[PDB]
């Protein structure tokens, strides 16, 4: 494979620093010019910085000029971005992208999100969404997971630890008036298999240490309880 993996992002207070790290595998890193391109929430793609393959030749957008410092270690096949004097607008998801000369960025990472705020981190509460005793649309029954009262973005929800991706709908996070976010993750499954299959939502919030696996199960509903 050809892999770029970004890390080092998260919550930082305005004015502080942070170090983004991007590790390359599966392609020749020595001959590739590396780029950083962020995306602000709801906004478009913005190129921030890039670095020549040989290193030592760097370029910066006028936005981050003088603040961000890009570097690479070719012995470690790692691209670095040192972000100093952060502002609110620098909040974004940051991608590292490899490119060869003027031929465009053909290699991309998964992205890492940098939140700039003066609010403290908070971990999510994970609550089950219990499928109803009927749920007859046909053989399809709906069940889900509720992820509430956390900050900052993002959160990662998987079902049965990546084993069930089918019919999974994880909604965008809604910012509440409390200043925290919330979102739900739902999946449709055969109703006849509710008692046979174990359904578990695996939630992960990086800014905290929270990792929760919540078993979702139907109840009696005759006497409730």
């Amino acid at each position: 494979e050809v892999q770029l993996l970004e890390s080092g992002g998260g919550l930082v207070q305005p004015g502080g620093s942070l170090r983004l790290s991007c590790a390359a595998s599966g392609f020749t890193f020595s001959i590739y010019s590396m780029n950083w391109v962020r995306q602000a929430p709801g906004k478009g793609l913005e190129w921030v910085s890039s670095i020549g393959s040989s290193g030592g030749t760097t370029y910066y957008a006028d936005s981050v000029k003088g603040r961000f410092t890009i570097s690479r270690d070719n012995s470690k096949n790692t691209l670095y971005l040192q972000m100093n004097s952060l502002r609110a607008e620098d909040t974004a998801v940051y991608y590292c992208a490899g490119s060869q000369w003027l031929y465009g960025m053909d290699v991309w990472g998964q992205g890492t999100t940098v939140t700039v705020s003066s609010a403290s981190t908070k971990g999510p509460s994970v609550f089950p969404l219990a499928p109803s005793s009927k749920s007859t649309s046909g053989g399809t029954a709906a069940l889900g997971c509720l992820v509430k009262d956390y900050f900052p973005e993002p959160v990662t929800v998987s079902w049965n630890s990546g084993a069930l991706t089918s019919g999974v709908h994880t909604f965008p996070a809604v910012l509440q008036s409390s200043g925290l976010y919330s979102l739900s993750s739902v999946v449709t499954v055969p109703s006849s298999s509710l008692g046979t299959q174990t359904y578990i939502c695996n939630v992960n919030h990086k800014p905290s240490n929270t990792k929760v696996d919540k078993r979702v199960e139907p109840k009696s509903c005759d006497k409730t309880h």
Binding site: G44, Y103, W108, G111, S125, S132, S135, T140, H169, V174
Partner: protein
């Protein structure tokens, strides 16, 4: 700086239709211009480089053209997974600049939402705040309205909505409406219902439950 402006900013086309995206550069960039596809929330992908050249593996239905100041991306035979935002970026001169983007939404037939309603969990009832969620699943178009009902009394100002991005397979949308109340305010009432009004529904669908019954 070389400024990139794309047209249109957003469009809707049926599967199989031809869509054309225009990219304009404020200065001559020769042929060095790249098209990127980005699925929502995912990482961008290189489609075209040096304006005419498909990246290896990219579907042939994507075709770039143009030169100098004028550039065009043509998607022939639109496919559902093509729902995404496309960007043009000039490689000719530094600083590198992208275009504003073009959001391409897939046009499909009107589909009615499947409505489920989930009571608050017992665990959440310990937190002094109860949330009841209404699921609108696999509907088109994106426009919908959730009417929340408690003991048939109308509710407003207490609910928030999230809408998923368009599905890459069936081109539908899913929506979640979350009704937030205090635990004491939840325990006083009985019937909780969300009434969904959608274009694909002749009369509104209502899913309901009683607080203690199930």
């Amino acid at each position: 700086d070389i400024q990139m402006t794309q047209s249109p900013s957003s469009l809707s086309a049926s599967v199989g239709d031809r869509v054309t995206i225009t990219c304009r550069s404020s200065q001559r960039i020769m042929t060095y211009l790249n098209w990127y596809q980005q699925k929502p929330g995912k990482a961008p992908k290189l489609l075209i480089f040096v304006a005419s050249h498909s990246q290896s593996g990219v579907p042939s239905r994507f075709r770039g053209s143009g030169s100098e100041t004028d550039f065009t991306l043509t998607i022939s035979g639109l496919q559902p997974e093509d729902s995404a935002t496309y960007y043009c970026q000039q490689s000719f001169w530094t600083p590198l600049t992208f275009g504003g983007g073009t959001k391409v939404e897939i046009k499909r037939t009107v589909a009615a939402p499947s409505v489920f309603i989930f009571p608050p969990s017992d665990e959440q009832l310990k937190s002094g705040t109860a949330s009841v969620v209404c699921l609108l699943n696999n509907f088109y178009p994106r426009e919908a309205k959730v009417q929340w009902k408690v003991d048939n009394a109308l509710q407003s100002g207490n609910s928030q909505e999230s809408v998923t991005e368009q599905d890459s397979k069936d081109s539908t949308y899913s929506l979640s409406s979350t009704l937030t109340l205090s635990k004491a305010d939840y325990e006083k009432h009985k019937v909780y219902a969300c009434e969904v009004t959608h274009q694909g529904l002749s009369s509104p669908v209502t899913k309901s439950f009683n607080r203690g019954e199930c």
